[PDB]
């Protein structure tokens, strides 16, 4: 399991949590020195539990699929909640089985469904450590509209920061002031599957992408990624979705 406490949180303690989250995900190989997530994991071992504590010390446990860093559901006191999708209903067979009741949320976990439920795109939702504290708080008591926004904050400040060093640093910059994500952040989230596949196809192709990946940069400038020498590959990306899952 891994844990993160908002009470006393700072850039350093958040970076330690994101390092523990990355290190909790199993891999048997690295591709261009980046851990390659597993094709598959059977049974309960598929799910990592992340224990998150709001500033007041209240807690939710979040279940994360270790092959793709997708959040499946979470437990808040005696109630479990899962996305309305087959992968999450499968997870509910393995995790939080001791909850007194299980609520299926009225959306799946992908960004488009969640933004629809929340009533706003994530370009307009501030993220940061204070937003994460609010999110854990929201999740403690069911409210499906409020929870959609909370889950957009939670996915970006946990999974997306584990996947990209750039996003982890964006959150660290927001340790004590929220701010909506940079266009570069949104670009990277949206590109993780694309990138993961092209970095894997590059082995066998002399480090060269079969298909270029188009990204927005730190300056709001639109750029093209064609090979593994790009900073996005050498420095930023931290985990690769296995092509078997693409």
CA distance 237 to 133: 26
CA distance 197 to 200: 5
What are the tokens at 165? 């060093």
Instruction: Compute how many other C-beta atoms are within 10 angstroms of the C-beta atom of residue 33.
Output: 8
Stretch near ligand AAG under the rule CB under 6 A, chosen from 90-98, 104-112, 132-140, 238-246: 104-112
Dihedral sign, Cα of residue 159, residue 15, residue 32, residue 38? negative
Is 70 among the annotated ligand-binding positions?
yes
C-beta nearest to ligand NAG: residue: 227
Is 85 among the annotated ligand-binding positions?
yes
Q: Report the residue number, 144 or 205, with the smaller CB distance to ligand NAG.
A: 205
What are the tokens at 41? 């994991």
Is 112 among the annotated ligand-binding positions?
yes
Stretch near ligand NAG under the rule CB under 6 A, chosen from 88-96, 162-170, 196-204, 221-229: 221-229
Q: Report the residue number, 68 or 230, with the smaller CB distance to ligand NAG.
A: 230
The SS3 assignment for 208 reads: strand
Q: Report the residue number, 190 or 234, with the smaller CB distance to ligand NAG.
A: 234
- Give the pairing type, strands 101-104 and 79-82: parallel
Instruction: Compute how many other C-beta atoms are within 10 angstroms of the C-beta atom of residue 214.
Output: 12
160 in catalytic set: yes
Of residues 79-98, which lie at the interface with ligand AAG (CB under 6 A)?
83, 85
The residue within the footprint of ligand NAG, chosen from 108, 227, 243, 245 (CB under 6 A), is 227
Residues that bind ligand AAG (CB under 6 A): 69-71, 83, 85, 108-111, 155, 159
């Amino acid at each position: 399991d891994v844990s993160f406490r908002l009470s006393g949180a700072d850039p350093s303690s958040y970076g330690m949590f994101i390092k523990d989250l990355r290190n909790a995900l199993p891999h048997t190989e690295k591709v261009y020195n980046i851990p390659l997530l597993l094709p598959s994991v059977s049974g309960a071992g598929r799910y990592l539990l992340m224990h998150l504590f709001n500033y007041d010390g209240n807690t939710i446990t979040v279940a994360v699929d270790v092959t793709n860093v997708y959040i499946m559901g979470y437990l808040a006191l005696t109630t479990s909640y899962f996305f309305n999708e087959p992968a999450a209903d499968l997870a509910s067979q393995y995790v939080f089985r001791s909850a007194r009741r299980k609520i299926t949320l009225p959306y799946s976990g992908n960004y488009e469904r969640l933004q629809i439920a929340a009533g706003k795109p994530r370009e307009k939702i501030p993220i940061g450590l204070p937003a994460l504290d609010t999110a854990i708080s929201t999740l403690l008591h069911y409210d499906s509209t409020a929870a959609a926004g909370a889950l957009l904050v939670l996915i970006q400040t946990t999974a997306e920061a584990a996947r990209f060093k750039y996003i982890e640093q964006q959150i660290q910059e927001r340790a004590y002031r929220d701010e909506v994500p940079s266009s570069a952040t949104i670009s990277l989230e949206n590109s993780w599957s694309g990138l993961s596949k092209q970095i894997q196809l590059a082995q066998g192709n002399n480090g060269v992408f079969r298909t270029p990946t188009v990204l927005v940069d730190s300056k709001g400038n639109r750029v093209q990624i064609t090979n593994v020498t790009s900073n996005v590959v050498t420095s930023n990306i931290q985990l690769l979705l296995n092509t078997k899952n693409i």
